[PDB]
């Protein structure tokens, strides 16, 4: 029963592909297993830029030894639910606030 935003095995390119597809918009996001760092996760989010138009940005979600997650060292969370709630409430460094999970 994965959360609506959790796409365990989706590649970075397929995340981009789906996030940029109809049904999604600015703020649309998903969390998937990182293709760069084994055992960690990546956050993919759609954003609208002045010149780029529609774009997707990726953030590495780093793991804290013995439990915990952070995108920026300055603020950590005990779990992904807390992290998603935090960035849903404030962009706090990110390119935009997390709005709705990727629609498929």
């Amino acid at each position: 029963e994965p959360e609506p935003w959790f796409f365990k095995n989706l590649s970075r390119k397929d995340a981009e592909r789906q996030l940029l597809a109809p049904g999604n918009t600015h703020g649309s996001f998903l969390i998937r297993e990182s293709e760069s760092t084994a055992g960690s996760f990546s956050l993919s989010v759609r954003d609208f830029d002045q010149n780029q138009g529609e774009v997707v940005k990726h953030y590495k979600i780093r793991n804290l030894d013995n439990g915990g997650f952070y995108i920026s060292p300055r603020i950590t969370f005990p779990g992904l639910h807390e992290l998603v709630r935090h960035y849903t409430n404030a962009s706090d460094g990110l390119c935009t606030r997390l709005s709705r999970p990727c629609q498929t």
Binding site: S42, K57, H58, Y59, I71, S72, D92, G93, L94, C95
Partner: peptide
């Protein structure tokens, strides 16, 4: 990757 982008940095937050």
């Amino acid at each position: 990757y982008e940095e937050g």
